[PDB]
Amino acid sequence: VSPPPPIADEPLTVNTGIYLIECYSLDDKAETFKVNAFLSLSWKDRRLAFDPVRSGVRVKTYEPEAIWIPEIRFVNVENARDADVVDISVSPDGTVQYLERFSARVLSPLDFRRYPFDSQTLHIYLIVRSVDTRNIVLAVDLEKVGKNDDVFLTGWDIESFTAVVKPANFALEDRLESKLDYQLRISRQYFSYIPNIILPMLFILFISWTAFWSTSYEANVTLVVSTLIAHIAFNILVETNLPKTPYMTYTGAIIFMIYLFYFVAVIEVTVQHYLKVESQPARAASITRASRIAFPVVFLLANIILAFLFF
Amino acid sequence: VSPPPPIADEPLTVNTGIYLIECYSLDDKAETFKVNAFLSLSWKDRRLAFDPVRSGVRVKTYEPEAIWIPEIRFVNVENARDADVVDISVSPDGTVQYLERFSARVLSPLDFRRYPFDSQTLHIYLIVRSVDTRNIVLAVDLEKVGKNDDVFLTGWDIESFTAVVKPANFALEDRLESKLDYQLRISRQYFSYIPNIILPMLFILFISWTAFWSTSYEANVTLVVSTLIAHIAFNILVETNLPKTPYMTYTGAIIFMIYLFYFVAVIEVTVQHYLKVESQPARAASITRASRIAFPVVFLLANIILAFLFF
Amino acid sequence: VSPPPPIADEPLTVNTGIYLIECYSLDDKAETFKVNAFLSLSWKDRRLAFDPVRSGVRVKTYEPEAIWIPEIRFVNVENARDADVVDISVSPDGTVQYLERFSARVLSPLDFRRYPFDSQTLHIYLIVRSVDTRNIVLAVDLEKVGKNDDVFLTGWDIESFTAVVKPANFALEDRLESKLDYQLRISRQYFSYIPNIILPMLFILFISWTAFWSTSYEANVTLVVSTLIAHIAFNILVETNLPKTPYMTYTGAIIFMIYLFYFVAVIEVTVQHYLKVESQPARAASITRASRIAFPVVFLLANIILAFLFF
Amino acid sequence: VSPPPPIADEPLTVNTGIYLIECYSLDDKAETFKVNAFLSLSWKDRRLAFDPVRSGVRVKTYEPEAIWIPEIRFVNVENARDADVVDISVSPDGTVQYLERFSARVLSPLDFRRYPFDSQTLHIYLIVRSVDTRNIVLAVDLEKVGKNDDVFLTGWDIESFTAVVKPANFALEDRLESKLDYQLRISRQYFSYIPNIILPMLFILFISWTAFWSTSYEANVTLVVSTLIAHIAFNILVETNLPKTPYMTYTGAIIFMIYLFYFVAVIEVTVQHYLKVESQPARAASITRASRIAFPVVFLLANIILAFLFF
Amino acid sequence: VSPPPPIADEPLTVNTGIYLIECYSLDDKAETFKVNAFLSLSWKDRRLAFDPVRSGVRVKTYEPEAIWIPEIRFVNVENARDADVVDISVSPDGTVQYLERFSARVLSPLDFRRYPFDSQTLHIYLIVRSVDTRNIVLAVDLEKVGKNDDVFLTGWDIESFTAVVKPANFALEDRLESKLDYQLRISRQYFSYIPNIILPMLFILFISWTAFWSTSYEANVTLVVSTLIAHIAFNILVETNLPKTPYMTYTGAIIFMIYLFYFVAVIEVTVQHYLKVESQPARAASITRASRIAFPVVFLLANIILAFLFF
Ligand SMILES: [Cl-]
Ligand SMILES: [Cl-]
Ligand SMILES: [Cl-]
Ligand SMILES: [Cl-]
Ligand SMILES: [Cl-]
Ligand SMILES: [Cl-]
Ligand SMILES: [Cl-]
Ligand SMILES: [Cl-]
Ligand SMILES: [Cl-]
Ligand SMILES: [Cl-]
Ligand SMILES: [Cl-]
Ligand SMILES: [Cl-]
Ligand code: NA
Ligand code: NA
Ligand code: NA
Ligand code: NA
Ligand code: NA
Ligand code: NA
């Protein structure tokens, strides 16, 4: 089977549509998400034309192997989509109406800069490579683009699923390629991060600052070192569920900055002890009294600066 | 092969029924489960009708390719079901009795609000898309709905497997779609959580309260900080086997609330030391004596409040 | 191809045999194991009978598609077995001798009550569904049931692989089903648990009891709290390689009971300090001297009670 | 297609050869390794013989379906090999030269007794089951057995890949089976274990022995208990990357023996304190001075004994 | 179908060209990476030549089964590539232009010596085995070798994708094999390692050196031992995301060397205490004052030496 011949010199327009049934496994480390959807294609193949008076049927149904079907592929998939043809219907004029249900792992880079208060635009790129005989161009039938009301992506809010109607027509290996951009806009549900990571991490930091109301070096060492170990645990936990970024993230900056506060607290606790041993507790008392105000103030200002830079 | 023609203008009723053989791999983080079951379908095709006295046989067996079979799909599956046709039998009047054995990974959302004292209603949605020639409607043959007595879902109790007999008939991309809801009711076996997470978590908390019976700041710092670290370990262990929810869970609220008790214990231990150093042990003695009663009382009341809000 | 017709009204007996080649991946958490074996089937089909004198051959080899083969399935498998037909041979009377090599992931519940000193009976259930024309019954050819001498299941001892010769004949979806039980008896190699989990866990417990020969509350707090944290690590390690059981296990009971010993040691250490501070060291000395005998005695008796209840 | 008929009563010799292209994924816990190799088979089929003078051609190429090919299988594979036929060539005498490229996950038991200073002999067992018409025997064509110079098994040194030329001919289910043993000799690259596990583990042990140069019970308790916790971490790390063995391993013995040194150090530290409190520091000084020599000496001797028993 | 016959005795040149669409999953531990690309092949088959005047067409499209296609395989792949033929086009002279889209898991070794400041040269080896009729040689059509501008390998910078134009022609099992080397040059994005592993690791080390400004053995023991435990955590974290190398890596050497600094700090802290107890604080003061300068100086010099040896 060869492609449909042109009436004049026009390219073959293949109208497309993606209808998402399910959205799952959005992997941050992998920068991949899974989709189970309907792919609908429509083109005119005048060779399939029939008279329903003779045929006895107003619409003809064909098996995929029986007729010519345009080779529509996905650009950013891991492996070739698992597809199952739902229906192929030809009307008397030769207008084929193809429908398949597919599942694919999609590659969509994520921007972790504002994590976990980030939003993402996922992409599903449809492509068609033109044949020798005639050029194939993609189109969007907006009536056949959508998503199920029950589509739930765990820990994410699905904002919109739209298509960039104008295809990206370009040359590749001396043949015309027509690309289409299906954009799924999502925003992260940041709720859980607050009682599970943020607040537990701030509590262990404030516990370390209780060493500013203690004269016991032994207990202060314990307070600041133990809480530093708990912060290393939170740092590990956070970085394990995230890919290695060549840029600084919001959570990354905060986690890092907090290490400096622990370092300076160790220095303060050390300075205080050296002075007490040197029989200068009045000077040690001045530094400790200052730290009590300085540490929360500098922490609060630094966080205002960071939130301002990122958001 | 085309669909069976209507006698008048009525839609084609496809009677259905799922019989679960196996239920396994209920992944909480993924909100998926694996099922191995029998799918039974039945419809009338008058073109397949025959006289039993003339044909000598009462039943005719066909290969799937030989006759028309309705395209029944599952809405909430990761990938298309692995199916194997068991039998296709035609009665004299033309009633086809189809049976297949399938295995599928089902996507069904879970409500972790009352975890690990939660119950779930898992869903298996059957769907059929109408053809251009005639509309297809789904039905439930209750005689062919069920589950094996040996069906065991590890760490869960299977209550019931029923079907919502009235299908959800709706339009989708200008064609009628008939949906059916098969509901598997399960309830979590909470036993193991008590000696593995709950009681160890409460013991470490009560160990921290022994600092209210000690005047040694160094030892108190150790008691409260060490037990806090052990609580962080349990918090991590619990949150790793659960998805990030946009709502507060029961275990989530308790775990969080316990961090406040540790924070206040550090404050108390600090307050007591500041007073002893300031040569005010009588006032420190009053606060420590109060804490001894206050901490268990407030803990007990807070838990009553939480259990009331969540149950 | 239809099933063999009966001479009278007798059911068709399909003689079966499983010969295990490999046994691997026994997953405790999943309650599954993988098997690679030979499945041998034998039935009489008189339509396939021949005269060896005229034919010149004492046997006839057929391709699976050429003749009727009974649809034998496994009940407790994740997905349908990966099978490859080794040979199909017909004798002059029409006795077909089928042989295939398969691999399957078998779902089989485990009893962790006596873990890690437990024994298990793994199951492989063979099933056949009767056709409308005639009923099919399963049989066991004991000469064709066995296992390779080199079959090794990592961390387990394979005791026996036998078959329950009498099939479970029952109705399912208005058709007779004949089930067969192949039982693989295995017993866990408990050796490794002793130097890796048991003895380390007892050593850390005995280290906590050295606080009964110390008057230093600070050091005692450290001894009992640190060893408690190491016990939490051993509890987590053990529970991670085991499924959540609705019953108490032997290792589970011991691990749990040990938390009580840590709790009481903290209480003792606290009591001793309160008395020393209250200028009552003679009373503290009495309690500490008692604990030195009480703790090992109660530990030894509790363990005797537990071992008795579980074995 | 039937097997080649015998000239007399001799069995059919199928000459074999495995040429390793890639060796990867040697899983210690699973006792499996993945291979990607060439399988070459050669046998004489007189029915395929021809004249090269009249046929003009020296060799005839056939598709696998066109001629009879012996069913060669692997004994110790997880699932049946992924094979792709490279070439089938027939010489004028009728000698068939088959070549396929395969990939398989091989099950081969490992001996962890001398780990991580262990060597292994991996096995690839080739097998052929005789047909009713004639018996099939395997052979090794040493000219067609080898490995690529670039074959790299991560963290292992590949010593040799040879074949045990004499097949294991035996009866199985009343038919002759001919087995061949392909042995891949490898030895573990132990380098990394020294700076990552061994030396860190010895350093933490020597840190615990600095308590023999301290009179501070509080500090000694900290030294011995903290280092014990770090040893538990290393024990967990090591045992997680190894299967549960019914025998004692070299690393297993050392790790275990080290727990005894920690236990005895706690006892010494406790004994020293009890004496100092009892106003007997001279006796405590004698024991502490003895321990300083005893602990390294007994450690050094115990290790000599262990290395002797294991090597 | 047989290969194209030679005009003289020349080998058949198959021009090749890989165009990368996607690069993902670079696993360091596994030394693998996944690729999704276009494979283009071109060869002259005179049997397929035609006159464009008589035929009425300038290009003839064929199905893969219709004509002879050279068996091109990848050397370093886990399993055989997942391929889908895009187009096969024949010009009047008989020049075939083949195009397929494939996906493969490629096994390419990595050099961790300079990790995480390392660069790698990934390899894709194309191979062809000569047939008995004629020899096949590979070539590179540089016009058809490239990569998409959007090709992103997470945590890596893609420098270039080129091909070694001269094939590696060699004998294998008495047949000519022609190998081609496609080299993908990448360099690691080291940014994230600095705030996540390097700086936290240096901070904990500097915290341990505050024991040189303290006379409290108890607090010093705590400072040096706790920070040592945090270093063990960072060593474990680093080594888990890396394979076991038979050579020393840059990060490996630093991590190891740091253990020596902790060991010597314990020795210093111990020496200081022994002297203070022996009523020699003046000598202890000299050693502690020396350590304050020695430790940072030796650390800085050792690091200069290491960076020099590795870069
Ligand atoms: Cl398509
Ligand atoms: Cl695709
Ligand atoms: Cl169907
Ligand atoms: Cl489906
Ligand atoms: Cl079968
Ligand atoms: Cl099956
Ligand atoms: Cl084969
Ligand atoms: Cl195989
Ligand atoms: Cl190809
Ligand atoms: Cl390939
Ligand atoms: Cl050569
Ligand atoms: Cl050649
Ligand atoms: Na087609
Ligand atoms: Na059909
Ligand atoms: Na059949
Ligand atoms: Na064949
Ligand atoms: Na071909
Ligand atoms: Na301490």
Assign A190 to helix, strand or coil. Answer: coil
Which residues are registered as beta bridge partners of B156? Answer: B188
| Per-domain residue ranges of chain A | 1-192, 193-311
Residue A239 contacts E, CB cutoff 8 Å? yes
- Partner C, chain B 184-223, Cβ-Cβ below 8 Å: 189, 191-193, 195-196, 199-200, 203-204, 206-207, 210, 213-216, 218-219, 222-223
Contact C169, C178 (CB under 8 A): yes
Taking the alpha carbons at both ends of chain D, their separation in whole angstroms is 56
Contact present, C80 and B84 (Cβ < 8 Å): yes
Helix ranges (H only) for C94-216 are: 193, 199-208
Closest to B49 measured CA to CA, from B86, B16, B13, B90: B90
Q: Is the separation of the CB atoms in E83 and E101 below 8 Å?
A: yes
Give me the sign of the Cα torsion angle A288, A294, A300, A304.
Answer: negative
| Bond into B109 cis (ω within 30) | no
Identify whether the C-beta of residue E1 lies closer than 8 Å to the C-beta of residue E65: no
Q: Within 10 Å of residue E102's Cβ, how many Cβ atoms?
A: 19
For C292, residues 6+ apart whose C-beta sits below 8 A from its C-beta are C209, C212, C213
d(C-alpha D107, C-alpha C73), whole Å: 26
Contacts of residue E237 in chain A, CB cutoff 8 Å? 236
- Decide: helix, strand or coil at residue A68: coil
E105 and E78 Cβ atoms separated by less than 8 Å: yes
Distance (Å, whole) CA E63 – CA E49:
16
Q: How far apart are the CA of D179 and the centre of ligand 7, in A?
A: 15
Q: Is the peptide bond before C116 cis (omega within 30 degrees of 0)?
A: yes
Point out which residues pair with E181 in neighbouring strands. Answer: E125, E164
Q: Mapping DSSP to helix (H, G, I), strand (E, B) and coil, where does residue C215 land? A: coil
Cβ of D225 within 8 Å of Cβ of C227? The answer is: yes
Q: Which two tokens stand for residue D28?
A: 């210690």
Six-digit token pair at C151?
A: 């079959």
CA distances from E18 to A173, E43, E103, E162, E181 (A): 11, 16, 12, 9, 11
Kindly report each contact of residues D290-293 with a partner whose C-beta sits within 8 Å and lies 24 or more positions away, as own/partner: D291/D212, D292/D209, D292/D212, D292/D213
Distances (CA, A) of A14 to A17, A64, E86: 10, 16, 17
DSSP class of residue A34 equals E
Q: At B85, which helix (H) or strand (E)?
A: strand B82-90
Angle in degrees, CA A74, A79, A84, rounded to 5: 70
Distance CA C211, CA C224 (A): 7
Lookup: tokens for E175: 């047949």
Distance CA(B243)–CA(A24), nearest Å, equals 13
Tokens of D13: 């010799």
Return the residue matching tokens 């297949």: B100
Phi, psi of B38 (to 5 degrees): -100, 135
State the virtual CA torsion across A80, A85, A91, A96 in degrees, nearest 10.
0
CB C299 within 8 A of CB C307: no
DSSP string, B258-289: HHHHHHHHHHHHHHHHHHHHTT-HHHHHHHHH
Q: Does domain D193-311 have CATH number 3.60.40.10?
A: no
Query: Can you read off the two tokens belonging to residue E242?
Result: 């890396």
Architecture of domain D1-192: Distorted Sandwich (2.70)
Q: Which are the contacts of E153, defined by CB distance < 8 A and separation ≥ 6?
A: E23, E24, E26, E33, E186
Phi, psi of A236, rounded to the nearest 5 degrees: -55, -50
The encoded tokens of residue A225 equal: 């070192």
Q: Which residue's structure tokens are 């006289």?
A: B51
E strands within A131-284?
136-140, 146-147, 156-172, 175-188
In whole angstroms, how far apart are CA B132 and each of A87, B90, D170?
10, 25, 63
Q: Which residues pair with C100 in a beta bridge?
A: C39, C85
Q: Assess contact for A40 and A89: CB atoms under 8 A.
A: no
Chain E residues touching D216 at Cβ < 8 A: 217-218, 221, 273
- Spatial separation of the C-alpha atoms in residues A206 and A201, rounded to whole Å: 9
Q: What was the elucidation method?
A: X-ray
Asked if the peptide bond before residue A116 counts as cis, ω within 30 degrees of 0, the response is yes
Contacts 24+ apart (CB under 8 A), E168-173: E169/E137, E172/D19, E172/E129, E173/D17, E173/D19, E173/D38, E173/D40, E173/D99, E173/D144
Q: Which residues of chain E does D239 touch, with a Cβ-Cβ cutoff of 8 Å?
A: none
Residue of A146, D107, B264 whose CA lies nearest to C34: D107
Q: Is the C-alpha dihedral spanning B112, B113, B117, B122 positive or negative?
A: negative
Dihedral sign for Cα C255, C256, C257, C259, please: positive
Residue ranges in C120-249 assigned as alpha helix (H): 193, 199-208, 217-240
Q: Where are the alpha helices (DSSP H) in A133-216?
A: 193, 199-208
Spatial distance between the Cα atoms of B293 and B156, rounded to a whole number of angstroms: 39
Enclosing H/E stretch for D283: helix D281-310
Sequence-separated contacts (24+) of B279-288 with Cβ below 8 Å: B288/B212
For residue E177, which of E249, E117, E125 has the smallest C-alpha distance?
A: E125
Instruction: Collect all residues with Cβ–Cβ distance below 8 Å to B139 and sequence separation of at least 6.
Output: B13, B14, B15, B16, B165, B167
What is the token pair recorded at A47?
Answer: 């060779």
Contacts 24+ apart (CB under 8 A), B190-193: B190/B116, B190/B117, B191/C245, B191/C246, B191/C247, B192/B155, B192/C244, B192/C245, B192/C246, B193/B116, B193/C244
- Among E111, E106, E135, E132, smallest CA distance to E121 is for E111
> Which are the contacts of E302, defined by CB distance < 8 A and separation ≥ 6?
E257
**A97 half-sphere exposure, CB direction, 13 A CA radius:** 16
Cα(C105) to centroid(ligand 8), Å: 17
Dihedral sign, CA of A197, A202, A208, A213?
negative
Q: Which of B78, B229, B248 sits opposite A230 (nearest CB)?
A: B229
Strands (E), B108-193: 119-129, 136-140, 146-147, 156-172, 175-188
Q: What's the one-letter identity of residue E92?
A: P
Which residues have C-beta within 8 Å of that of residue A218, sequence separation ≥ 6? Answer: B218, E216, E218, E219, E222
According to DSSP H, which parts of A15-69 are helical?
52-55
Of B203, B236, D263, B209, residue with least CA distance to C257 = B203
> What residues have CB less than 8 Å from A34, skipping those under 6 apart?
A22, A23, A24, A25, A26, A103, A104, A105, A106, B78
D101 touches chain E (CB under 8 A): yes
DSSP A130: P
3-state secondary structure of C85: strand
CA B214-B219-B222 angle, to 5 degrees, is 130
SS3 D159: strand
Nearest to E33 by CA among E111, E101, E124, E94: E124
Would you call E173 and D19 a contact, using CB atoms and an 8 Å cutoff?
Answer: yes
Q: Which of E142, E152, E143 is nearest to A172 (CA)?
A: E143
Contacting residues of A for B236, CB less than 8 Å apart: 233, 237
What percent of chain C is helix, strand and coil (3-state, nearest 5)? 35, 35, 30
Nearest to A130 by CA among A215, A11, A28: A11
Q: How do B175-188 and B95-107 pair as beta strands?
A: unpaired
Is beta strand E175-188 parallel, antiparallel or unpaired with respect to E156-172? antiparallel
Tell me how far apart the alpha carbons of residues B162 and B149 are, in angstroms, rounded to a whole number: 15
Residue carrying structure tokens 């037990």:
B227
Write the secondary structure of chain E as one string of H (helix), E (strand) and C (coil): CCCCCCCCCCCEEEEEEEEEEEEEEEECCCCEEEEEEEEEEEEECHHHCCCHHHHCCCCEECCCCCCCCCCEEECCECCCCEEEEEEEEECCCCEEEEEEEEEEEEECCCCHHHCCCCEEEEEEEEEEECCCCCCEEEEECHHHCEECCCCCCCCEEEEEEEEEEEEEEEEECCEEEEEEEEEEEEEECCCCHHHHHHHHHHHHHHHHHHHHHCCCHHHHHHHHHHHHHHHHHHHHHHHHCCCCCCCCCHHHHHHHHHHHHHHHHHHHHHHHHHHHHCCCHHHHHHHHHHHHHHHHHHHHHHHHHHHHHHC
Nearest to A22 among B76, B173, B217 (CB): B76
For C33, the token pair is: 């194991």
- Where helices occur in D133-249 by DSSP H, the ranges are 193, 199-208, 217-240
Q: In terms of C-beta density within 10 A (0-12 exposed, 13-18 middle, 19 or more buried), how is residue A207 classed?
A: buried
Q: Residue C185 pairs with which residues in a beta bridge?
A: C121, C160
E162 and E186 Cβ atoms separated by less than 8 Å: no
At residue D225, φ and ψ (nearest 5 deg) are: -70, -45
Question: Are the beta carbons of B252 and A216 separated by less than 8 Å?
Answer: no
| Amino acid, single-letter form, for residue E147 | K
Tell me whether residues D99 and E277 touch, CB distance under 8 A. Answer: no
| Cβ(A129)–Cβ(E86) below 8 Å | yes
List B residues 125-154 in contact with A (Cβ-Cβ < 8 A): 129, 131-133
Beta strands D60-61 and D82-90, pairing class: antiparallel
Q: Is the dihedral of CA A239, A242, A245, A247 positive or negative?
A: negative
What span, in angstroms and rounded, lies between the C-alpha atoms of D86 and D94? Answer: 19
Q: Which residue has the tokens 């500041």?
A: B274
- Give the number of the ligand closest to the Cα of residue D22: 10
What sign has the CA pseudo-torsion C32, C36, C38, C43? positive
Residue whose C-alpha is closest to residue A183's, from A124, A105, A142, A139: A124
The tokens of A102 are what? 């597919």
Query: Do B76 and B18 form a contact (C-beta atoms < 8 A)?
Result: no
Q: Which residue has the tokens 């002759």?
A: D176
B191 beta partners: none
Do C232 and B233 lie within an 8 Å CB cutoff? yes
Q: Closest Cα partner for A251 from A195, A185, A303, A188?
A: A303
Q: Which of B196, B200, B210 sits opposite C270 (nearest CB)?
A: B210
H/E run at residue C147:
strand C146-147
A141 phi and psi, to 5 degrees?
A: -95, 100
- How far, in Å, from the CA of E135 to the mean position of ligand 11? 14
CA–CA separation, C131 and C2 (whole Å): 9
